[PDB]
Design a protein around this ligand. Structure first.
Ligand SMILES: O=N[O-]
Ligand SMILES: O=N[O-]
Ligand SMILES: O=N[O-]
Ligand SMILES: [Cu+2]
Ligand SMILES: [Cu+2]
Ligand SMILES: [Cu+2]
Ligand SMILES: [Cu+2]
Ligand SMILES: [Cu+2]
Ligand SMILES: [Cu+2]
Lengths: 333, 333, 333
C-alpha cells in the first residue's frame, strides 16, 4: 500500500550538477516527490547571439537530472504556468504505460498535474515532452532531461564488485534546427504558430544547425568548466533525446561505460568513444589520473568544434610522467 | 548427404506477420524450401499520395520474414517474372560465400533460380537484392527483408534460461530517396533508366525523404496496428538494410534486446532505445504490463513523426495503478 | 625506471598492411620507438580526378597502424618538415593526459618532438591530429590513423580461449568534405588559408562528399585487393576518426567483433554488421570458409557504392557446396 511508504521531497538543481542522493539505498522503497515548472523562454545558444524560443523543464536545457532507486515510486507535480502559451506533457522512458506518462500529463497553460510511476528498471533514462502531433518540435526546442534509477545496492562492475563515484555530472546534448533562409541566415518569428511550419521544414532537413551541451555553445567552459581532482571517480551521465551521439573524454577514457544506460548489464571497459543512440541516456565512469584541461565532446568533431558539442574539465593535482611525458619538447633541429 | 534430409515447404506471409514455425526445433536439420516472386510495382508511400516504383520480394516492403533453425539448409526458388523490367538477385547476410548468394542468383525477367545455403549462425539477418553496379538503388527501392535463424533449443536469456515469445512481428524500416526538384517537389519518371541518374543524385544527398515501417506512412496503424495482451511476451524483429535506426517502444522497453541481432550473444537488458546499424536486423523481447495504445518508433523523433518511422500497438487488458497512475488529473488551480 | 627497459625500434608500413609484431608478448614491457613524418600532399581521391590537399602522417591516408602491448611505453618522434605549411600535433586515444598528447606535440614546420606515453589499456584506438581551433579540418583532411595495444597474452574469445590471427589488415575510413559551388562542382584553392572558410562551410553541412578506404575510391581493389585463403583467420582493424561506420564483409561475417575496439570486453559473436562510432577503432576476426571475391563495405550502401566506402578480398581455395550451392542456375522456364 503506497500510502504506508515514506515520502521524500527532492529539491532539484540546475544541470550539469545533480541533486543530493545516496548511491546505496539507505531506506526501503519510497515515494520520491519532484516538482518541475515548465518555462517557455528565449535563449541565446551561440557566440553570434542566435536566439531561439526554448521549451524547458525548470528553466534549463536540459531539464534537471532526477535520481531515485529501483522500485521507488516517482511522483512528479508538473506545473504549466499561464505565462506559457503552449500545451505540454511528459514521457518518462523509465516508466511503463500511457506513453511513459505523456497520455496522462497533458497540461494547458494555467494547469498542473501529478503523475506517479514505479521505477522498475535501473538505469539512466531520457524524459521528454511529447504532445501528440508536435513531438519533435518540443523535444528539439530543449524540452528533455533524464532520470537516473540506481540499483538499491549501487553500481557494480563487470565482475559484481562495487563502483562508487565521488562526483556526478549530467551532460544533456541538444540538437537544434534553427530555420534558415535561402542565403543561410537564421529567421526569427512573431508567434510559435507562425514559427511552426518553418520549424517542421528545418527539422525535415535532418541537419542540426547547432549541437550543444547544457543549452549553449561554450556552456561547460570557463567559469562553468566541469572540475575534478586526480584520483577522483566521476560518473558522467549523458543524454540525447533525438539523435545519436558519440561521447569522448579527450585525454581520458570511459573506464566503465553503460553506452545505452541500463545498469543490469555489465559495463563496457576502457572505451575511447561510445554510441549513445538518439532517445537514450548513457553513463561513463572514469577515474582521473592526470591534471590539466580535458575536453569532453561528441566525437563527430565537426559537431564538437563547429556546432557546439564540446565542454571542458579542469582537473587539479600532480602530473604523472610515467603515464605521459614530453621527452623532447617541440624544437627546430 | 543433403538428399537424406527431410524437406519442408514454407508458405510465407505478408509482414508484419510471420509464417508458422517452432521456437525449439521439433525435428533434426531440414532443407527448408521457400519461394519468392519478385514484383516491381507502384506504391503510394505517404499521406500526400507520393508514388514510387518499388522493387519487392513477394509484393511487399519489406520482403517477408523467413524462419529456420541453425544448421538447417535454406533452399530458395527466386522467380523474376517477365512482367518485370530489371535484373535482380539476392544476398543473404545469414549465408557464407558468393556475396551471400548474390553472385549465384542473377535473374533476368523471365528467369528463375534456386539457391541453397547452410544457416550456420543463429540470429536475425538482413536479406536484400544487390545487382553489381546498382546495389543501393535496389535496396532503397524496398528490395530487402530479413531471415531469422533460431538456435535449435530456442532463445535464451543472459543467464541461459529459456525466453519464449507468445507473438512475433517483423518491422522492416525503409529509407526512401524520392528525387526532388530545386523547389522541393518530388519528380516522377517514364522509365527506370530515365529515373536512375536522379535516383543516384537523390541517394548521394544521404538524406531520406521518407522513412517508413511496412512500406508506407501509417502502415502499422489503425486497422493495421500491431496487437497484444497484457502479460503476453512479444518478439519484435526490426531490420534496416541501409541506415542506422534507434527503435523505441513508447510506454515500454526492450526487456531483452539483441541490438545487432545475433543470438549466441547475451541480450542487453531493460533497454529504452537501442542502435540497429544499417545493414542489420535486431530483435527485442518485451512482456506487456499495461493496456492501451503504444507507439513503436525510430527515436529520431523527426524521422518518426515527420518522415514516417512510427507504428502502433493496441494492447488489451487491465490497467496496473501500482506501475503508473494519475494522482491529480490535469486541472487549473 | 624506464631507462632500464629494452628499447625496440619499429619500422612502419603503409596501410592496409601492418608492421611485424608478436600477438603474445615475447619480452617484458618495452619502450617501443616509432617515427612518423608529417606530409601535406595533393591526393586524387576518386575516379573523376578530384584532387584535395591531404594532411598525412607518413604520406598515407590513413596513417600507419602502430602495434604495441599493454603496459609498453610508446615513444613517438613526430617530424614536421619545413616543406609543410601548417602546424600539426598528435592525440592518441590510447594515452592518458594532455589531450592524448596533443597539448605536448605542437610542431611548426621545421620542428620535431618526441612524446612518450604508457599504453595502459588494451584495444585498437584512433590517433589523430588536433590543433586547437582547427581540429576537424586536420582530421577530415586525412590526418588520422590507429594504434593497436594487444593484451600481453594475446587476444581471447568470449570464454577466455585464445584467438590467434594468421593475417591482419588495417582499413582506415575517411570522410572528406570537398567544398562545392552552388551548381554542385568541387572548388580548388590557392592556399590552405584561402581554403579554410570554405572547408568549414563544407564540414558544417555534415554531409561527406566522399567516404573512402585507404585514401581513395577503389584503393583496396584490383591489384590492391586484400587477400586470404580458405581457413585463414583474419583480423580487420577498422577506424573512423570523425563519423559512424557500419562495417560488413559481403559473403562473410565478423565471427568475433570488438565493435568499439577494447579487448578486455568479450567480443560480439556472429555479427553481420556492427557500429564503430565516429572517434573509434574496432576490430573483427573472421575465418574464411569460401573462396572467391568478397566486398568489405560500410553498409550504408550509398556510402559504399556511390561515395567510395568499399574494398575487396580475393580469397583462394576450394568451394564448399555444403555451405552454399546453386541448385538450379538462372535460366528461363
Ligand atoms: O579526442 N578528441 O578528438
Ligand atoms: O518515447 N518516444 O518518444
Ligand atoms: O552485404 N552487403 O550488402
Ligand atoms: Cu512541451
Ligand atoms: Cu521518447
Ligand atoms: Cu533488385
Ligand atoms: Cu548487405
Ligand atoms: Cu595536422
Ligand atoms: Cu579524438
Amino acid at each position: 500500500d503506497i500510502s504506508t511508504l515514506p515520502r521524500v521531497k527532492v529539491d532539484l538543481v540546475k544541470p550539469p550538477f545533480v541533486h543530493a542522493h545516496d548511491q546505496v539505498a539507505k531506506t526501503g522503497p519510497r515515494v520520491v516527490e519532484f516538482t518541475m515548472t515548465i518555462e517557455e523562454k528565449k535563449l541565446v545558444i551561440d557566440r553570434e547571439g542566435t536566439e531561439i524560443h526554448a521549451m524547458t523543464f525548470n528553466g534549463s536545457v536540459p531539464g534537471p537530472l532526477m535520481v531515485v532507486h529501483e522500485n521507488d515510486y516517482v511522483e512528479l507535480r508538473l506545473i504549466n504556468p499561464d505565462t506559457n502559451t503552449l500545451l505540454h506533457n511528459i514521457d518518462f522512458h523509465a516508466a511503463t504505460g500511457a506513453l511513459g506518462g505523456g497520455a496522462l500529463t497533458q497540461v494547458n497553460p494555467g494547469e498542473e498535474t501529478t503523475l506517479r510511476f514505479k521505477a522498475t528498471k535501473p538505469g539512466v533514462f531520457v524524459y521528454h515532452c511529447a504532445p501528440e502531433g508536435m513531438v519533435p518540435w518540443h523535444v528539439t526546442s530543449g524540452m528533455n532531461g533524464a532520470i537516473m534509477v540506481l540499483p538499491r545496492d549501487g553500481l557494480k562492475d563487470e565482475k559484481g564488485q562495487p563502483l562508487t563515484y565521488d562526483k556526478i555530472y549530467y551532460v544533456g546534448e541538444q540538437d537544434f534546427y534553427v530555420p534558415k533562409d535561402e542565403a543561410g541566415n537564421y529567421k526569427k518569428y512573431e508567434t510559435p504558430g507562425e514559427a511552426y511550419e518553418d520549424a517542421v521544414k528545418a527539422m525535415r532537413t535532418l541537419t542540426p544547425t547547432h549541437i550543444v551541451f547544457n543549452g549553449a555553445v561554450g556552456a561547460l567552459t570557463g567559469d562553468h568548466a566541469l572540475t575534478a581532482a586526480v584520483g577522483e571517480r566521476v560518473l558522467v551521465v549523458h543524454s540525447q533525446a533525438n539523435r545519436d551521439t558519440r561521447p569522448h573524454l579527450i585525454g581520458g577514457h570511459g573506464d566503465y561505460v553503460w553506452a545505452t544506460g541500463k545498469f543490469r548489464n555489465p559495463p563496457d571497459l576502457d572505451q575511447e568513444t561510445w554510441l549513445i543512440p538518439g532517445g537514450t541516456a548513457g553513463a561513463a565512469f572514469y577515474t582521473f589520473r592526470q591534471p590539466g584541461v580535458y575536453a569532453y565532446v561528441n566525437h563527430n568533431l565537426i559537431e564538437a568544434f563547429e556546432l557546439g558539442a564540446a565542454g571542458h574539465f579542469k582537473v587539479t593535482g600532480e602530473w604523472n610522467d610515467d603515464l605521459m611525458t614530453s621527452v623532447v619538447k617541440p624544437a627546430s633541429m
